[PDB]
Amino acid sequence: MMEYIDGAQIALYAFWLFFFGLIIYLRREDKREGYPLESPQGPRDGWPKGAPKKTYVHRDHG
Amino acid sequence: ILAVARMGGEREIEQITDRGTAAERSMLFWRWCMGFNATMESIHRWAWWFAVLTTFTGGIGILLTGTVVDNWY
Amino acid sequence: AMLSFEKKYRVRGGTLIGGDLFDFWFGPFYVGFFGVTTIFFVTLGTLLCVWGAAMGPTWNLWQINIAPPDLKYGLGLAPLREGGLWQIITLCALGAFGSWALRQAEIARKLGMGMHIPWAYGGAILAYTTLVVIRPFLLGAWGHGFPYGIFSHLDWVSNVGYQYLHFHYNPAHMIAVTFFFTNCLALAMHGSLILSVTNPPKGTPTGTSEQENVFFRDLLGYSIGAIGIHRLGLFLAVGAAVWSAICIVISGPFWTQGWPEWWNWWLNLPIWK
Amino acid sequence: PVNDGIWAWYGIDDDRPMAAWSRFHATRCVEQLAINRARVGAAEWALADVQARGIVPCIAKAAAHLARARAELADWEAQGHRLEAARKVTPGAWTTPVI
Amino acid sequence: EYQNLFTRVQVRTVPEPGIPIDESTGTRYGTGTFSYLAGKFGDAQIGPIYLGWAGVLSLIFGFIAIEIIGLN
Amino acid sequence: GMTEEEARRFHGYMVTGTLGYVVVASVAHFLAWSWRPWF
Amino acid sequence: GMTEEEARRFHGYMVTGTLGYVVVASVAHFLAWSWRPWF
Amino acid sequence: GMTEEEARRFHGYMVTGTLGYVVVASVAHFLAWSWRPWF
Amino acid sequence: GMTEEEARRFHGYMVTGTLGYVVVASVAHFLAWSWRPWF
Amino acid sequence: GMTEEEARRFHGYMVTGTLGYVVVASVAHFLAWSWRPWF
Amino acid sequence: GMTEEEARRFHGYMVTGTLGYVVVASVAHFLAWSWRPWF
Amino acid sequence: MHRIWLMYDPRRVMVALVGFLAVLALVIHFVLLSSQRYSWIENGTLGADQAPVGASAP
Amino acid sequence: MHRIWLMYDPRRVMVALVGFLAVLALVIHFVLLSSQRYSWIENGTLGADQAPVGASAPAA
Amino acid sequence: MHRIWLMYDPRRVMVALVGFLAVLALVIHFVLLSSQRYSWIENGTLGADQAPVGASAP
Amino acid sequence: MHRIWLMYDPRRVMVALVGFLAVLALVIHFVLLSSQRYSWIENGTLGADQAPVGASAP
Amino acid sequence: MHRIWLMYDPRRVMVALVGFLAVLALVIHFVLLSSQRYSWIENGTLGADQAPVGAS
Amino acid sequence: MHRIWLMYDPRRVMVALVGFLAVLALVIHFVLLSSQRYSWIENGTLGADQAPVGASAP
Amino acid sequence: MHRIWLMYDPRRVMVALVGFLAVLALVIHFVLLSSQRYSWIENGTLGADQAPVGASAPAA
Amino acid sequence: SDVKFVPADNYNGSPIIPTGNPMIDGVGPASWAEDRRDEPDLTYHGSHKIVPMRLDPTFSIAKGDPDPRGLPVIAADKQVAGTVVELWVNRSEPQVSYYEVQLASGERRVLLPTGYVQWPNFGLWGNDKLLVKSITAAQFANVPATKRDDQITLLEEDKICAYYAGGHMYAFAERSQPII
């Protein structure tokens, strides 16, 4: 049987894969405003590339 | 938000739908401080995930204790 | 690079020390005089941490351990192998954390913002300064500081706790824990409310301050308002760190027995002694 | 209490009706007379504005607010007269009149 | 420099929110009120609560749980 | 952005510094090897 | 962005540099195997 | 967005790259197998 | 900004200062090696 | 900022303060050496 | 704000006060050295 | 099945595939490297009959 | 049956399906790899008669 | 093949690639330098038959 | 080959290069200084025949 | 070298230099003060042949 | 030398100086009070021959 | 060679250089002062025949 | 010139220098979001969110707070700027959003956001004048106008708040300089 690999180690790497995926998601969200960046060399996106700028629909009132 | 509240920065929904100088200054402060920034919306996602992951990772650690690992040291 | 709206904001002014001399940016980062001092203390402190790892038994990130001196050295600098390196790194860390706070003030001044962020960070600096300066100084030896090591400082926390037999009974610690837990609850509620009005189900208009106030009102029974939840979040998060600093400074300098026997005053109130 | 605030806990209260001479009550009275006359002026300007634009339920409240501003002013004028009478009969009081 | 840490001037409104947004089934319990102390730090209105069926049952089940603990 | 003439001019210095640095490092390695060879 | 002609020019450099790097790494593995084989 | 022509052209390279990758993996597994089989 | 003449004038000071500092460091190492050599 | 003639005048004082400070330090070191040599 | 004349006046006091302080402190050291010398 | 590249942007899919393969290869290599039988950096030079094997039924 | 794709966007479903299958496959492999009987990396070369078996009824 | 550079900015890919290769090379070297057999700084002068080997089956 | 400096600003590349080589140089020196064989501050005056060697196989 | 002050206006950097020197002097004194050989507050009267040497 | 006061506001310099000297005096007194030889509040009446001295070289 | 100062502002290259040298100089001194052989404050008066030399254990 | 600022020099990361008056042009801390929507912010029920209290009869000052109307406003240079004559309230979350100040000179009325007003003793007593540290009494004359006297657009809210935000740097030439 596997001596070194155990269920706590497996679960921890499952979390790390999820968590880095989450940080990527959050950094895409962070870039909906102010991007692409202005620079002397032209537009810059950084990484990851930002999600598009989002339009909001207001209500018709009552 | 308190630091930009005089510029209307606490009206966070309008700063999200209709970005004002209070949002821009908030983004620039953190960008100039630590080299990256959120938005007025996305800071609330960072907030939401940090709080949620506190108890979610907690529960996993409890479930592993005494079932998979009996001596964590 | 710059955000699409940024260039307009990059004026001179708002510095505390250097005037125009250091009043420039490096990529996204504002420099300033305290940017220069930050990078000095960060680089020196980091390279001394790497030297501590080099002369220790392993490079394993979790096991690196730069320990303070023995208590017998009192308030002197020990030999560098014997804890003096920890003492130099502690001076660098104080220099870095202080420089970071003052740099944030220069940035806030340049943007016309209030000084809230520098002071809120002062709550964390206070807690660090309590652990490595104020409490060791009141106990009379720098060796009372915590070791710099990702898990070895957790061994320190464990042993300091059991120095008082049952640290959960520390009354300031109960308050500090209550603030940390209340803060995490409040953060989840505030984060959820803003996202729920800005990201309603598909085919629903964007929400309003009225809806989040109505929802918040029947959650807690009262409406806190937009400024109120940010005041509360700042109060809870910074208040946790302040009560943390209190709970550790009373342990040892002012109280020495087990913490459970501190509660003897409550049992002896004369209405029920 | 808005004016003395925390000092009302220690019994400093320079708003209370006073009929003997008191330089502290006279000081408070002179400050509050100016503020309340400005406040009456603003109240009747606001009535004139809201009458001009004609909104009936707002005209009602603007008149009610103006009446309250006049009444609050009249209390300070009464305080001013008491102190001014006491000034004339009391040695070492002010030479400049109250009200 | 004003720190914006507490509110020196509150304003009352005589009609009030607290009558909810359009909400359908269940009932709004109580009438809205203002606390001057709540108004110092945050918004002043202390006011109506919604339960519905799930809120009522939650309080009944929870009260029994609290009673059993306290009585023991 | 640079003219291609400016890129050409910069590239000459960049190659020359890289070569110089590699030479100094090569001497440094052979001194280290002579004193305490790692294979 | 690039024209297809610029994309073709870059591809030549990219493939050549990639294969060059693999050749240098191939000599590194030849030397390492001759010093201390891992199978 | 791709035309269906560009999609169908890109698909050819993708199938070819996948095949090249599976070939290398197959050789690698047979080298691994003949050195230390796992069944 | 600064002109090529200003850049050239600054460079002359900058190179000289570097080389003077390196010379002073050389004598410091000569002294230290005399006191307690490290190889 | 200051003019060159101001900078020359300031430099004259700054150099002299530096020499004064170094002289006091030099006497301090020689007193210390006389008391307790470190080599 | 300040002037050559104003600066000269203040400098006279600042120098005098500093030197006066150092004189009194030197007498304290004389007394301390007489009581319990440190070398 | 090329309409999958109309369904999904190939620039995103191909980065997803590269990331997937990178993670999966690293997982498998580190699992094997943590075993006894395939700890090849320490023991790769052992012959197939000398390599470790886990215990049988008794 | 095909009107299921009118209820559900196939572009969401295929991602959700691939996610489920990848999770499920990894869960089953690691559950087996943790077992005695099927720890195939260390014991895969054992014949079926000599692979481990959980203990039978103990006559307690 | 060159149309891949119409899908991806070569300036971005080259930065990505150098980042990947730098990390990967550092990881492989540190794995080897952690090992017994390839602690080359301490034991690199040993002959190939003197270098450590992991345990066999008994 | 100079057109690499048209794809990348030399001002940025030299910052990246100075940063990279500074870190790499400090890494290698501290790694060697942590070793037994190359702890040259304590042991640099030992001859090659006198310097440590990591334990060989039995 | 006087042209240095045309880069670095002295009124903005004297408090920098002086702050650097004051901290550096304090560090050196505290390093000496708790060495065995130079703990002059406790042992300054000993004289050089009696003062400690930290030999191995 | 007096033109230094045209660079710096004496009102601020005198505060910074007095603060510095107050801290410095307080530190030097505390260093002496914490010593053995100069802990004068307890041992100040001892004659200079009687006062403590640190250990010599063995 | 001098056009490096058209690429970079000399006012802040000099700041970054001086800071680097100060950090480097302090590190090397603290490293040497940590060693036994070069702990010069405690042992600087020892001649080179008395100065420490580190060795590995013989373990014969 | 139709550009509000220029680079201090050619190097990357250098500050910009305003070409005119920064408080008026909107550079640095005086900037506003220049593309912000020029429409009133609305309540849930679709009425104007921020209005003079004169036009909503449901509102009043709470018991126990000072009434700010009739108080003198003391500017950064300790001169009286004017008198508060009206309050503007946020109707979605009951607040005073702006004080409206009758200027002592030239007889404009200008808005003053409540986040720029300090009460004398942190409000603990006195409560008889309003302190505005950000701008001088002269600078009050240039506070951006509101194109109607009964509503304010999101763009105008940004212009007005930005004008006082710029005063912490530009109200006096000394405020840009360091403390040493």
Ligand SMILES: CCCCCCCCCCCCCC(=O)OC[C@H](COP(=O)(O)OCC(O)COP(=O)(O)OC[C@@H](COC(=O)CCCCCCCCCCCCC)OC(=O)CCCCCCCCCCCCC)OC(=O)CCCCCCCCCCCCC
């Ligand atoms: C367990 C619970 C944890 C809980 C705590 C969790 C913390 C999570 C938050 C921190 C991570 C986010 C940091 C961040 O986003 O910074 C912005 C930066 C660049 O921003 P950009 O907008 O995309 O691009 C700007 C660029 O286009 C133009 O800028 P400019 O031309 O002016 O300057 C050049 C850039 C060059 O970039 C860099 O130098 C990158 C520096 C290092 C990036 C982060 C590496 C990983 C962490 C640090 C490891 C080295 C640390 C010593 O210069 C800059 O932009 C510098 C500004 C960014 C400085 C970021 C400093 C972050 C420090 C984080 C410390 C974490 C400590 C744990 O982003 C990036 O470079 C890419 C970041 C990608 C997300 C990170 C997660 C990746 C997960 C793994 C996925 C697979 C591999 C990527």
Ligand SMILES: CCCCCCCCCCCCCC(=O)OC[C@H](COP(=O)(O)OCC(O)COP(=O)(O)OC[C@@H](COC(=O)CCCCCCCCCCCCC)OC(=O)CCCCCCCCCCCCC)OC(=O)CCCCCCCCCCCCC
């Ligand atoms: C890690 C700890 C935890 C903390 C962990 C978290 C760390 C967070 C930081 C992470 C890195 C952030 C990087 C960043 O933000 O960069 C912004 C910058 C801006 O790009 P740009 O705006 O487009 O371009 C700027 C450039 O065009 C103009 O620069 P400037 O003129 O303003 O400033 C000059 C620079 C430095 O100049 C040079 O380096 C070149 C000097 C001439 C070289 C000549 C050849 C030499 C050959 C050898 C000959 C030799 C013989 C002669 O510096 C300044 O003046 C600015 C002030 C610097 C900061 C103040 C320093 C104060 C003093 C203390 C210094 C202590 C020592 C550092 O971006 C770039 O330049 C491109 C990206 C550069 C990446 C740099 C980092 C690479 C690290 C790689 C490590 C990889 C490990 C796996």
Ligand code: BCL
């Ligand atoms: C000697 C003591 C042990 C220790 C033992 C434990 C144990 C045991 C646990 C933790 C857990 C936690 N510990 Mg620990 N912990 C120690 C040292 C520390 C230190 C420190 C500085 O030393 C810190 C900061 C922490 C921090 C933490 C948290 C991160 C974590 C709890 C998260 C949370 O939100 O919980 C607070 C949130 C909740 C409990 C969720 C509650 C939600 C429910 C729905 C609320 C119901 C309310 C109900 C309606 C009302 C009831 C009324 C009454 C019936 C009257 N521990 C040491 C090592 N710690 C937990 C964890 O996750 O571990 C992995 C845990 O179980």
Ligand code: BCL
């Ligand atoms: C007032 C203008 C000058 C001044 C003018 C003089 C004159 C004139 C004489 C001295 C003399 C002396 N001064 Mg002087 N002196 C000043 C400032 C100082 C300061 C200082 C910290 O600033 C110090 C330490 C001294 C110290 C000294 C001594 C070296 C010396 C005599 C002993 C002494 O200390 O008397 C105590 C004095 C002080 C601690 C401070 C000064 C007090 C007052 C202002 C002067 C007293 C002079 C004394 C009564 C002698 C009178 C001589 C007859 C009139 C002929 N002076 C100011 C700046 N000084 C005398 C000398 O040369 O003797 C050898 C002398 O004749």
Ligand SMILES: CC[C@H]1c2cc3[nH]c4c(c3C)C(=O)[C@H](C(=O)OC)c4c3nc(cc4[nH]c(cc(n2)[C@@H]1C)c(C(C)=O)c4C)[C@@H](C)[C@@H]3CCC(=O)OC/C=C(\C)CCC[C@H](C)CCC[C@H](C)CCCC(C)C
């Ligand atoms: C993300 C992690 C953090 C988290 C989040 C979180 N907690 C939450 C929420 C969120 C997002 C909620 O929305 C929910 C909530 O309602 O918040 C106000 C909740 C909540 N978090 C709670 C507590 C809590 N959270 C904690 C922690 C955490 N909460 C984490 C730090 C802790 C800790 C640290 O120990 C506690 C104690 C509650 C306040 C609340 C859930 C309330 C609940 O479920 O109540 C059930 C009901 C009862 C126990 C019964 C009460 C009985 C009455 C007193 C009886 C009165 C008489 C009655 C009227 C009789 C019936 C008659 C009928 C006819 C009417």
Ligand SMILES: COC(C)(C)C/C=C/C(C)=C/C=C/C(C=O)=C/C=C/C(C)=C/C=C/C=C(C)/C=C/C=C(\C)CC/C=C(C)/C=C/C=C(\C)C(=O)O
């Ligand atoms: C512990 O073991 C571990 C660490 C784990 C093992 C692993 C190690 C690994 C993975 C190592 C990898 C190393 C590596 C990989 O490639 C290393 C690569 C190194 C390289 C390439 C170095 C290059 C250096 C180049 C230099 C110095 C250039 C200097 C240039 C100069 C001086 C001129 C500047 C220009 C001028 C003056 C022009 C102005 C005129 C202008 C502008 C005009 O005229 O216009």
Ligand SMILES: COC(C)(C)C/C=C/C(C)=C/C=C/C(C=O)=C/C=C/C(C)=C/C=C/C=C(C)/C=C/C=C(\C)CC/C=C(C)/C=C/C=C(\C)C(=O)O
């Ligand atoms: C035990 O440890 C564990 C970790 C467990 C073991 C396992 C490890 C594993 C799984 C490893 C996997 C590795 C791997 C997998 O794929 C590795 C893949 C590596 C790859 C792809 C390397 C590719 C390198 C390519 C290079 C260097 C290209 C250089 C190009 C150059 C120089 C040209 C630059 C352009 C120019 C000059 C044009 C300018 C002009 C222009 C633009 C003009 O003119 O326009």
Ligand SMILES: COC(C)(C)C/C=C/C(C)=C/C=C/C(C=O)=C/C=C/C(C)=C/C=C/C=C(C)/C=C/C=C(\C)CC/C=C(C)/C=C/C=C(\C)C(=O)O
């Ligand atoms: C523990 O062991 C570890 C630490 C691990 C071991 C490893 C160590 C390592 C890796 C070390 C690396 C070291 C290194 C690498 O390169 C070191 C490189 C050092 C260098 C480059 C030093 C350069 C110094 C230059 C100086 C001092 C310049 C002075 C200039 C002056 C005085 C004049 C300025 C001009 C003026 C005033 C004119 C104005 C006129 C104007 C404006 C006009 O006229 O306009």
Ligand SMILES: COC(C)(C)C/C=C/C(C)=C/C=C/C(C=O)=C/C=C/C(C)=C/C=C/C=C(C)/C=C/C=C(\C)CC/C=C(C)/C=C/C=C(\C)C(=O)O
């Ligand atoms: C293990 O680590 C450890 C143990 C620590 C070991 C390692 C230690 C190390 C590495 C130490 C390094 C030390 C160092 C390195 O450089 C130290 C460098 C020191 C230096 C530079 C000292 C310089 C001092 C200069 C002074 C005092 C000048 C004063 C000038 C004055 C007073 C005049 C002011 C001007 C006037 C009056 C005119 C106004 C006129 C005007 C305005 C007009 O006329 O207009």
Ligand SMILES: CCCCCCCCCCCCO[C@@H]1O[C@H](CO)[C@@H](O[C@H]2O[C@H](CO)[C@@H](O)[C@H](O)[C@H]2O)[C@H](O)[C@H]1O
């Ligand atoms: C502050 C006085 C108490 C501490 C004295 C310290 C001990 C030294 C005593 C020296 C005598 C008194 O100190 C002496 O006073 C005079 C007059 O006030 C100062 O004189 C100073 O102010 C006068 C004002 O008229 C200027 O004209 C003159 O140019 C300037 O130097 C001297 O600079 C100072 O040296």
